[PDB]
Amino acid sequence: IDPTEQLAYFPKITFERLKNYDTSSNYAKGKLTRNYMILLPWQHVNRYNFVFSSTGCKVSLKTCIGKLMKDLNPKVLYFIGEGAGNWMARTACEYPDIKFVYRSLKDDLDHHYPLEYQRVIGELSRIIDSGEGLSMETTDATQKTHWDLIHRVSKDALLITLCDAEFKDRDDFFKMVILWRKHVLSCRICTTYGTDLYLFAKYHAKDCNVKLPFFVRSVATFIMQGSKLSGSECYILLTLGHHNNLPCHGEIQNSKMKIAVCNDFYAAKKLDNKSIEANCKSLLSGLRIPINKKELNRQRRLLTLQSNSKVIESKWLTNKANTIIDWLEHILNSPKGELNYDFFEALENTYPNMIKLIDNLGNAEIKKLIKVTGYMLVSKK
Amino acid sequence: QVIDPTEQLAYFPKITFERLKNYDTSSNYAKGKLTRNYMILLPWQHVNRYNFVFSSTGCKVSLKTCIGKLMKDLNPKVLYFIGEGAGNWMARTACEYPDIKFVYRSLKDDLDHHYPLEYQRVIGELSRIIDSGEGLSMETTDATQKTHWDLIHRVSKDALLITLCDAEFKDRDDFFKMVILWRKHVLSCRICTTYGTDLYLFAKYHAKDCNVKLPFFVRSVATFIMQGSKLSGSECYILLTLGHHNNLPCHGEIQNSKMKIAVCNDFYAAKKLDNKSIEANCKSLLSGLRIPINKKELNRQRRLLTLSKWLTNKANTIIDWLEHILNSPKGELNYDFFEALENTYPNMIKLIDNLGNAEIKKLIKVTGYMLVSKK
Ligand SMILES: Nc1nc2c(ncn2[C@@H]2O[C@H](COP(=O)(O)OP(=O)(O)OP(=O)(O)O)[C@@H](O)[C@H]2O)c(=O)[nH]1
Ligand SMILES: Nc1nc2c(ncn2[C@@H]2O[C@H](CO)[C@@H](O)[C@H]2O)c(=O)[nH]1
Ligand SMILES: [Zn+2]
Ligand SMILES: [Zn+2]
Numbered sequence: 024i025d026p027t028e029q030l031a032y033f034p035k036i037t038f039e040r041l042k043n044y045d046t047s048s049n050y051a052k053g054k055l056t057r058n059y060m061i062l063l064p065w066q067h068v069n070r071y072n073f074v075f076s077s078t079g080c081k082v083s084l085k086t087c088i089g090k091l092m093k094d095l096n097p098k099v100l101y102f103i104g105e106g107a108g109n110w111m112a113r114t115a116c117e118y119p120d121i122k123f124v125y126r127s128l129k130d131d132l133d134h135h136y137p138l139e140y141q142r143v144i145g146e147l148s149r150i151i152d153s154g155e156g157l158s159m160e161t162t163d164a165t166q167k168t169h170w171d172l173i174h175r176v177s178k179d180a181l182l183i184t185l186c187d188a189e190f191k192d193r194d195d196f197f198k199m200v201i202l203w204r205k206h207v208l209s210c211r212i213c214t215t216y217g218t219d220l221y222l223f224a225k226y227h228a229k230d231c232n233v234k235l236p237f238f239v240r241s242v243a244t245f246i247m248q249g250s251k252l253s254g255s256e257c258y259i260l261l262t263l264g265h266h267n268n269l270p271c272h273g274e275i276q277n278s279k280m281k282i283a284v285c286n287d288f289y290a291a292k293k294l295d296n297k298s299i300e301a302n303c304k305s306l307l308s309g310l311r312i313p314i315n316k317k318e319l320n321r322q323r324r325l326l327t328l329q330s331n332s333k334v335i336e337s338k339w340l341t342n343k344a345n346t347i348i349d350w351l352e353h354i355l356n357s358p359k360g361e362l363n364y365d366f367f368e369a370l371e372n373t374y375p376n377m378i379k380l381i382d383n384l385g386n387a388e389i390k391k392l393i394k395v396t397g398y399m400l401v402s403k404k
Numbered sequence: 405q406v407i408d409p410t411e412q413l414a415y416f417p418k419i420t421f422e423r424l425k426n427y428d429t430s431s432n433y434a435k436g437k438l439t440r441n442y443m444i445l446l447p448w449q450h451v452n453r454y455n456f457v458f459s460s461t462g463c464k465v466s467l468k469t470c471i472g473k474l475m476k477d478l479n480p481k482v483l484y485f486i487g488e489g490a491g492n493w494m495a496r497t498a499c500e501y502p503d504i505k506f507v508y509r510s511l512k513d514d515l516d517h518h519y520p521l522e523y524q525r526v527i528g529e530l531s532r533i534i535d536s537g538e539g540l541s542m543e544t545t546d547a548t549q550k551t552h553w554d555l556i557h558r559v560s561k562d563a564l565l566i567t568l569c570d571a572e573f574k575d576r577d578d579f580f581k582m583v584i585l586w587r588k589h590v591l592s593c594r595i596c597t598t599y600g601t602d603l604y605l606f607a608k609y610h611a612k613d614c615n616v617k618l619p620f621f622v623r624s625v626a627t628f629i630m631q632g633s634k635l636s637g638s639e640c641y642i643l644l645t646l647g648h649h650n651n652l653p654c655h656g657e658i659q660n661s662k663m664k665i666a667v668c669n670d671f672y673a674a675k676k677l678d679n680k681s682i683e684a685n686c687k688s689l690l691s692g693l694r695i696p697i698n699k700k701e702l703n704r705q706r707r708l709l710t711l712s713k714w715l716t717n718k719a720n721t722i723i724d725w726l727e728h729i730l731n732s733p734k735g736e737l738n739y740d741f742f743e744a745l746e747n748t749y750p751n752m753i754k755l756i757d758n759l760g761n762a763e764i765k766k767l768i769k770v771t772g773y774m775l776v777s778k779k
Contacts, residue, residue, distance in 0.1 A: 050744065050747065051747065052743075053440060053441050053442065053443065053743070054440070054441070055439075055440045055667065056437075056438075056439050056440075057436060057437070057438040057439070058436035058437060059436055060434060060435060060436050281667065281668075284438060284664060284667060284668065285664075285667065285668040368433075368435055368436065369433055369435075372433035372434050372435065373433055
């Protein structure tokens with residue numbers, strides 16, 4: 024299967040690049056605030072074409088760091104804390120000749136194998152190092168051993184290292200940043216390319232005026248439309264050089280808000296009907312495409328015939344089902360609008376049983392529910 | 405010598421607006437608020453208005469843009485413009501719709517234009533104004549008086565399908581006087597009664613209060629929030645019709661919609677430059693000011709002033725600002741960049757204190773030209 028053809032399944036990306044300047048601002052700018060009364064993760068609205076990971080819908084190398092990718096021209100890319108590898112899968116479609124070195128923490132929580140890359144690309148042939156036969160310690164980016172064994176297959180320098188790992192504290196993030204630096208300055212292979220080595224990593228801009236480790240200079244800060252509205256998540260492009268400050272909550276919030284108020288979510292050019300069906304069946308077993316009044320009423324019929332392990336115990340499973348159908352029915356009866364938080368705020372505040380929904384469905388179920396919602400909204404008119 | 409209206413249309417800038425359709429449902433959801441405090445003191449809504457002199461209402465509101473579908477469906481042969489002043493809104497309409505004839509009205513007083521000066525400058529001749537209100541009293545040109553409405557058909561025998569009002573009223577009571585009289589006419593008048601309830605009044609309104617009921621049998625169809633309206637206020641254009649009455653737009657609804665256009669959208673510049681109009685505004689701002697405005701042109705004005713201290717103080721203030729605009733980097737036409745321009749100027753309060761409302765509006769037109777002229 025052609026990678027460039029598969030690229031039409033990933034949506035377009037809207038973002039803001041805040042280039043780090045040595046010279047002071049000297050502006051004294053106002054603040055941009057808009058309190059969206061939303062309870063659902065609407066950043067999954069354009070991610071219906073994906074199942075196990077959908078990071079590729081949020082961040083893209085060709086979109087954000089396209090010029091650096093062109094200039095440096097990496098033969099191999101290093102993906103750490105990647106999970107099911109959907110951001111790595113998008114990269115494989117945008118750059119069809121690049122090989123990959125994948126690493127992800129080996130635990131029961133989430134994934135430690137690229138299930139989505141396997142799904143999108145078809146085969147793991149381009150993943151020259153998938154971290155097979157490694158310990159939990161050697162797959163942890165906060166440990167020295169992870170960095171020591173990074174070249175066990177690939178002998179190419181760490182020109183562009185991609186990190187989408189979620190850390191406990193900022194101290195764990197610092198552990199990784201320090202270890203990256205220690206490697207790129209010690210390693211025989213890497214030392215050859217010098218200071219022109221990059222680490223593009225996910226960071227949550229909590230505080231302000233926080234100094235990066237020594238000889239770690241942030242080049243730019245990327246604020247994604249795909250990042251959760253509630254937080255202060257961003258992607259920082261780091262390099263070796265005279266250290267500077269991590270992005271502050273303030274700047275991130277102003278940029279985060281402009282994107283939420285102004286821009287609309289771009290839908291995918293093509294529809295992966297097998298992936299949509301998978302998410303539909305993942306949300307509610309037996310859910311079929313297209314989702315219409317007829318399709319919804321049969322799901323209402325299927326639960327009626329079941330009621331007419333304990334007998335009282337199965338009432339929990341049917342309660343979840345009703346909640347899902349009630350929401351999808353509400354989306355169906357809702358007028359078509361543009362994919363934006365103003366319209367999403369309207370959808371939620373037009374629904375009477377909103378709090379019952381959040382109470383009855385888990386975080387993963389509600390994310391799945393948004394993928395299905397997004398498909399339905401795109402399917403309209 | 406021949407003046408084409410469609411060619412003249414390239415002098416009016418593009419319009420950005422938000423239409424808030426009034427829904428019978430009587431069920432509005434609970435929403436959040438959008439706030440951004442722009443530290444601005446100048447009427448920046450005049451930046452894209454350099455090509456106009458006496459009136460520039462057409463830079464802000466347009467019939468083809470805002471109510472193009474209604475203009476198509478109800479194809480009006482004649483349009484009625486009340487409280488029009490120099491008639492720049494009417495002039496834009498004449499360019500967008502080259503076959504429509506007009507009936508013009510504006511209050512006959514020393515305080516405002518009671519003759520379409522801008523229409524004349526744009527179109528060339530008053531041939532399409534079949535009724536310019538010639539030989540009428542101040543009472544018969546006041547939209548709050550019955551006699552104004554009684555004599556509206558003295559020339560035109562076409563129904564009031566679309567009535568345009570850009571009048572500024574003292575109280576909301578005066579606005580209500582007009583709205584009531586429009587209704588009284590469109591329901592009494594032999595000519596108008598024929599078209600029934602499908603008659604419209606697109607009037608300018610300041611959304612001050614909330615949950616204010618429109619007069620009986622007067623129903624608002626939609627509310628238009630213009631980018632061209634002053635940021636500070638709560639000015640909007642309401643499209644009214646005959647029907648079971650509803651509520652006037654509330655200050656609340658407006659402010660969010662008003663703010664979005666300020667944060668998101670940029671001011672579109674005019675495709676062509678009316679160099680005669682620019683020169684007129686330049687000479688209106690400061691006598692002897694010539695285009696292009698450059699370091700050489702500004703230093704000449706500094707020199708000319710060296711050889712009545714009140715008049716020279718105003719001149720220095722103007723030159724100081726234009727010099728600041730000249731030395732300023734080119735940016736996009738938006739409130740973020742405009743906030744930067746006056747945040748970068750040290751004598752901001754002296755400016756507002758030394759120049760009148762009309763002078764500052766002229767100063768912004770000249771500023772807009774200079775900003776567009778860059779790079
Ligand atoms: N919460 C959240 N997850 C995001 C966001 N952007 C990307 N993600 C990633 O997407 C994952 C959840 O989406 P999926 O992998 O598509 O699907 P899911 O199988 O329904 O979910 P989980 O068990 O919650 O991971 C998260 O664990 C993140 O790795 C975001 O803004 N918010
Ligand atoms: N939008 C807007 N237009 C104005 C304002 N004041 C005057 N104008 C119009 O703009 C023209 C400027 O010459 C005036 O003749 C009026 O028609 C204002 O505060 N806002
Ligand atoms: Zn190395
Ligand atoms: Zn009549």
